[PDB]
Amino acid sequence: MAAVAGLYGLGEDRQHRKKQ
């Protein structure tokens, strides 16, 4: 998730932490 478009700045790593 890297919707970093200034007025909508939404960034977030959703990695598959510990086998997901």
**3-class DSSP string for 3-18:** EEECCEEEECCCCCCC
Give the three-state DSSP class for 2: strand
Half-sphere exposure of 15 (CA within 13 A, CB side): 3
> DSSP state, 20?
-
The answer to whether residues 12 and 3 touch, using CB atoms and an 8 Å cutoff, is: no
- The letter for the amino acid at 8 is Y
> DSSP state, 19?
-
Structure tokens at 5: 């478009």
CA nearest neighbour of 12 among 2, 20, 4:
2
By what method was this entry solved? Answer: NMR
CA dist., res. 10 & res. 20, Å (int): 23
The answer to whether residues 4 and 10 touch, using CB atoms and an 8 Å cutoff, is: yes
Give the three-state DSSP class for 1: coil
